[PDB]
Ligand binder design. Structure first.
Ligand SMILES: [Mg+2]
Ligand SMILES: [Mg+2]
Ligand SMILES: [Mg+2]
Ligand SMILES: [Mg+2]
Ligand SMILES: [Mg+2]
Ligand SMILES: [Mg+2]
Ligand SMILES: [Mg+2]
Lengths: 178, 136, 82, 119, 48
RNA sequence: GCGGGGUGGAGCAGCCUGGUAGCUCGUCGGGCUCAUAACCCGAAGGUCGUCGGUUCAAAUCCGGCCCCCGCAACCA
RNA sequence: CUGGUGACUAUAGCAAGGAGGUCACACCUGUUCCCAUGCCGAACACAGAAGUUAAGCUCCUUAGCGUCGAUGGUAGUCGAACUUACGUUCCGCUAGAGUAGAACGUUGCCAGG
RNA sequence: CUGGGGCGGUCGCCUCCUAAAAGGUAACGGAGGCGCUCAAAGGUUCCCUCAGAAUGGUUGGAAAUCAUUCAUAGAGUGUAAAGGCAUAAGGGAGCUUGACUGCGAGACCUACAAGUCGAGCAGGGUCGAAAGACGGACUUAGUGAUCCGGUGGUUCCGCAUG
RNA sequence: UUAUUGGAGGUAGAGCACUGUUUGGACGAGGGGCCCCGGGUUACCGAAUUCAGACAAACUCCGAAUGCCAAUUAAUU
């Protein structure tokens, strides 16, 4: 619980001092992490989705939930109810472990890493990170992976504003592009 | 030629013409306007003729507001046909005008110029008219 | 005599005699149809059943009362006479 | 920013839907169960007259004791049934209150059945 | 559903019910539990 | 009044049965020939008459509009 | 006063500002067990109580919005007389819109304070 | 049938407007659908809430899947339209076959023949802890008399009697 | 038949809350003709939004007069 321990002690102290929170409950926290992989290629080949599912299962350590198309789009050759993606929701200990690994190992492994974007906030204190390849994650092996694929990592924070969210992520040690 | 871009129904019941004007009985965009004192259908052609006449006299120095729009389509049977076998094809587009309705509004000119311009417009229209000003 | 075209209309279904079958304040025996309707313009009330076609019927002998059921809804109920 | 739902409001919506087909007559009064994080409350209600015939709760001193919430629930269910017996109530319709029929809510219901209230 | 089906009680062979099925959707003879009047009990009834 | 058709530059398929633009000629680049034609090789080119509608999706289905074609236009 | 559970067409709502926490209600703490996730103890379920009024919630103020809403007048209209006038007149009924105003709920039962 | 007849069009059924605020109401009046479909798209129990928009994010583009907020229904409801449905009639899952048998007080509609709704009773069941719900489908089209013949069942008849 | 009372229903009128139709104002989400990954500004502003003003047999936030159905209802017939 290294990341959790920091949050409980060091991060909480920094945030409450910074924003003059009246109560400890006010202090922002990361509610959940959702990893989404969109696989439109799955329409062309079912195997592509299967390979993605395995990769996400390895990365997160939990079985992904296959996502089915809400609607049919002719341009994408998409039919409603077709499996075109996979998602995992990480909560509790699993979330902290994944996040610490991302900052500690996976983000460093990113090729030509120049820090993460500071502008990637929804305006409601929620941050989304896009990874170019899943090779960055330590578990994934280059030989095993037939096709390099990107992923969306959404970090949902209880923080009302981006600035409070930015502080929380900075305290966690998330690199920022500045 | 003013006409609706589309309508849900091309063949419609002809409008009720008895009664007095529901709305647009006051000058709201201009200094002066033309008020209808009689009831009649006003065609798109009639509106254009009246519009062209008033703009010419005004010399385009003033601004013209056309209050009435010909929403309702009306049909006519092909020539030399007997009765029945369906309603005819759309022939024109008309606005129902009842007494009190302000047909046009004019601004950016002296009253004298406006009175003449509206007079020229009035002679192009089926209804009888009276020159009117904004009231306070 | 000019030749003539034809209309593509000329069709209508039989009217279904929908609406109220019994008055408010009238005694009805059980099973009496109170209202005929598509959907529920009037909801089934007290001692009133709704049929598969949404017909409202008395489930007991009593007096018919049409009542408000919220701001924009109405119901019909039957109450047994003393 | 992620909103946290109010659990009571959600269950109340669920209760209203249950209430459409469920009502308490004098002959068959409704047994309403309200469950909080710490306590469970039971009321026998006649909906036609809009009156509560009997009540029993964990917060009540007699029922209050050191026990698991399910254990307490059984005690509340036994208590309400005995009180209902005093008022001559044997037939009741169980109102789950919009809560799932499991655990604490079930234990209260089962206890009342065992005591003699007929569901 | 494209075809009319007759369901016969397996035990007594009585053609108690008639129904419809889609032959393409349900190529096999359909079977279902139905009340049999002669038996006065629910029994498996199979399409003839 | 009622049918049919409008698809690379030309002629002609695909529509019935929505997802797929074909064939022959022409055009274009190369070759053969002293040169041309013929012949040989490679290649490009049609928003499917036009506006709308329906549909995830329209050459295809449905409705107007324009153009063209066929048939009918009778009894006094 | 608080809570549970009912009645009523939002005058009851929404929004904004403020206040409140032995109990109660939450948030919350865990997942051993009952039970649960088309992945996730998020939820559901259960076992709890370290912390917290932050939020929900409850209360107070308000009339910005939503809601309610006259009187008077008008449109329309039953009947009648007169007429053929895109009509008139008389009588009864009488809107919609808008205006003044109302309104930040009113209450039944049961258990606690 | 027909604003003479022919020719053209049409013929049953469903929905709307014409229809004059009950119902009903015509023209070769104005608009559209039907001659099905579904083994769940039926029953029940439990659970759930949309479309759209803004912003952030990779393959990813206006638009795929993800996240937050706003969003009262502009979504969905097999299939026309209308009336309904967000206490769902819409969506998901588990279990099922009530898409039961005998019926039926009363009522609607109605020239007749038909057509429609129906509480409740009995038998035997499904789902539910239970109350209870279920005699198809959100409702209203998807259909054709009699005669005759085929097939299955039958404590019915059997031309002196079997 | 009338009086009194209760009810069903959506027409006239009206209105624009919905579905369409429509006039004149402003106004812009976002880049192109335009002036710098280093900013601007004389179309389109089509999205959208807003203020004012109109239209509808198959529009309705509304909504009569009448007519209709009833009442252990009274008067007259
Ligand atoms: Mg009809
Ligand atoms: Mg040559
Ligand atoms: Mg009517
Ligand atoms: Mg009428
Ligand atoms: Mg015969
Ligand atoms: Mg014999
Ligand atoms: Mg009108």
């Amino acid at each position: 619980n290294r990341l959790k321990e920091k949050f409980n002690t060091e991060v909480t102290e920094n945030l409450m001092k910074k924003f003059n929170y009246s109560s400890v409950m006010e202090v922002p926290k990361i509610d959940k992490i959702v990893v989404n992989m969109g696989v439109g290629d799955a329409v062309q080949n079912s195997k592509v989705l299967d390979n993605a599912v395995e990769e996400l299962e390895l990365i997160t350590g939990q079985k992904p939930l296959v996502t089915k198309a809400k609607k049919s789009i002719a341009t994408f050759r998409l039919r409603e109810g077709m499996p075109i993606g996979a998602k995992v929701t990480l909560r509790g200990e699993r979330m902290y472990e994944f996040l610490d690994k991302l900052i500690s190992v996976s983000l460093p492994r990113v090729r030509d890493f120049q820090g993460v974007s500071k502008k990637a906030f929804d305006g409601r204190g929620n941050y989304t990170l896009g990874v170019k390849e899943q090779l960055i994650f330590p578990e994934i092996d280059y030989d095993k992976v037939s096709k390099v694929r990107g992923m969306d990592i959404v970090i949902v924070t209880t923080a009302n504003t981006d600035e409070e969210a930015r502080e929380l992520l900075a305290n966690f040690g998330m690199p920022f592009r500045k | 030629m003013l006409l609706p871009k589309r309508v849900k129904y091309r063949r419609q019941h002809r409008p009720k013409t008895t009664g007095r004007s529901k709305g647009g009985n006051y000058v709201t965009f201009g200094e002066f306007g033309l008020q209808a004192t009689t009831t009649s259908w006003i065609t798109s052609r009639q509106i254009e003729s009246a519009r062209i006449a008033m703009t010419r006299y005004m010399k385009r120095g003033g601004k013209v507001w056309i209050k009435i729009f010909p929403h309702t389509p009306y049909t006519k049977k092909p020539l030399e046909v007997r009765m029945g076998a369906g309603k005819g094809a759309v022939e024109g587009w008309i606005a129902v005008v009842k007494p009190g309705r302000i047909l046009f509004e004019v601004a950016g000119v002296s009253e004298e110029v406006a009175r003449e311009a509206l007079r020229l417009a009035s002679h192009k229209l089926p209804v009888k008219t009276k020159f009117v000003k904004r009231e306070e | 005599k000019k030749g003539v075209s034809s209309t593509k209309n000329g069709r209508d279904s039989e009217s279904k005699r929908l609406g109220a079958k019994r008055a408010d304040g009238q005694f009805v025996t059980g099973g009496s149809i109170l209202y005929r309707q598509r959907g529920t313009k009037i909801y089934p009330g007290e001692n009133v059943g709704r049929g598969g076609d949404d017909t409202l019927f008395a489930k007991i002998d009593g007096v018919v009362k049409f009542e408000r059921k919220g701001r924009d809804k109405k119901q019909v109920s039957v109450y047994a006479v003393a | 920013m992620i909103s946290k739902i109010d659990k009571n409001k959600v269950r109340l919506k669920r209760h209203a839907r249950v209430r459409t087909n469920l009502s308490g007559t004098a002959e068959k009064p409704r047994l309403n169960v309200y469950r909080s994080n710490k306590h469970i409350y039971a009321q026998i209600i006649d909906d036609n007259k809009g009156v509560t015939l009997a009540q029993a709760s964990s917060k009540d001193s007699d029922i209050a004791t050191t026990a698991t919430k399910v254990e307490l629930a059984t005690k509340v269910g036994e208590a309400i049934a005995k009180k209902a017996a005093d008022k001559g109530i044997k037939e009741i319709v169980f109102d789950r209150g919009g809560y799932l029929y499991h655990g604490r809510v079930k234990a209260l219901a089962e206890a009342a059945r065992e005591s003699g209230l007929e569901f | 559903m494209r075809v009319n089906v007759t369901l016969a009680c397996t035990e007594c062979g009585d053609r108690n019910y008639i129904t419809t099925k889609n032959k393409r959707n349900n190529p096999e003879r359909i079977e279902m539990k139905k009340y049999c009047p002669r038996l006065n009990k629910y029994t498996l009834h199979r399409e003839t």
